[PDB]
Write a protein that binds this ligand. Structure first.
Ligand SMILES: CNc1ncc2cc3cnccc3c([N+](=O)[O-])c2n1
Ligand SMILES: [K+]
Length: 336
């Protein structure tokens, strides 16, 4: 249905000329276009698949990005700037400013190697300052993942690292922005029950309701994947997910197990997971206590993992906020 209207050379709205593809998905694809009514400025256009789930999501996003671009005309809090929208061959299309590689794609194209700690520090601050901007405006992103954190420009320098014995890319400028607002939800809007699995919060898996706290859990999973270079919860089964958590973070709070509508996962108020099963032995040996993931014992590594630990607090009512986190000493090195 879609592969026929997003080819190199097509011209949309008699304006934008498609160059190449930036990313595919179930919602549709994002393509880099030459704007011919603006001297040749390259842009990005998202072509939403003609599905009611994704057509409505695009409509929910255009609204949010109108509020967030009015309130912040300069992108001080680093949300992506939407420029225009229009129909094309029956498909909704949204025009954004052209950014660089997503933080996920950079790690992938770099052989799944981690970021430097000072780069992690700057990136974590901009993410927090950005998502905390949404939390101040009664909003929740719900879909925070490395594929939605994009580099303003992903240009790097390459060299041979005789420690790891490999070519290693190194970012020149690591400023980021946050994209995809089709799942965002105001505090009063209807909160749907299911909101990606690897970055889903424990209160969501257990179906207890959610708000801004769930976004902080997602940022904790993003930060630990910047530090390690791979997903810490790499699974699709919900019971395996919770099992991995209990090995990395410890047993779930009892008052949360008692309130879940998902009685299937548990038995007698404890996770019905056999340690000595088939998969139970992969979880026991792939996962480990969170503190044991630290690559060094220098104080700056200690401080990051203290931030990540407070971000991965089970109880959302006890979990850190983003206002508190912006003051945490891991960000001391950036201030005067
Ligand atoms: C998934 N949602 C979404 N929203 C806005 C986007 C803006 C972009 C701007 N410059 C490059 C890629 C951009 C992508 N992208 O390819 O991922 C976007 N993706
Ligand atoms: K629902």
């Amino acid at each position: 249905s879609m592969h026929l209207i997003c080819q190199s050379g097509d011209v949309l709205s008699a304006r934008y000329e498609i160059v190449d593809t930036l990313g595919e998905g179930a919602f549709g694809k994002v393509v880099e276009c030459i704007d011919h009514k603006a001297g040749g400025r390259h842009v990005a256009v998202k072509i939403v698949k003609n599905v009611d789930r994704y057509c409505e999501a695009a409509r929910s996003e255009i609204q949010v990005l109108e509020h967030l671009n009015t309130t912040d005309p300069n992108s001080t809090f680093r949300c992506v700037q939407m420029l225009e929208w229009f129909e094309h061959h029956g498909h909704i299309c949204i025009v954004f400013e052209l950014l660089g590689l997503s933080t996920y794609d950079f790690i992938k194209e770099n052989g799944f190697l981690p970021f430097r700690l000072d780069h992690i520090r700057k990136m974590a601050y901009q993410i927090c300052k950005s998502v905390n901007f949404l939390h101040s405006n009664k909003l929740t992103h719900t879909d925070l993942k490395p594929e939605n954190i994009l580099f303003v420009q992903s240009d790097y320098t390459e060299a041979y690292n005789p420690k790891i014995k490999r070519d290693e890319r190194t970012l020149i400028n690591p400023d980021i922005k946050v994209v995809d607002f089709g799942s965002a939800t105001y505090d009063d809007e209807h909160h749907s029950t299911l909101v990606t699995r690897h970055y889903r919060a424990p209160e969501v898996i257990l179906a207890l309701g959610w708000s801004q706290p769930c976004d902080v859990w997602s940022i904790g999973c993003i930060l630990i994947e910047y530090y390690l270079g791979f997903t810490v919860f790499p699974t699709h089964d919900s019971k395996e997910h919770l099992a991995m958590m209990e090995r990395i973070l410890g047993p779930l709070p009892k008052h949360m197990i008692q309130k879940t509508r998902k009685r299937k996962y548990f038995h007698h108020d404890r996770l019905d997971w056999d340690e000595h099963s088939s998969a139970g032995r992969y979880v026991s040996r792939a996962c480990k206590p969170l503190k044991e993931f630290m690559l060094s014992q220098d104080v700056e590594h200690e401080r990051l993992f203290d931030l990540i630990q407070k971000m991965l607090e089970y109880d959302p009512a006890k979990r850190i906020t983003l206002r508190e986190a912006l003051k945490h000493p891991f960000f001391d090195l950036l201030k005067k």
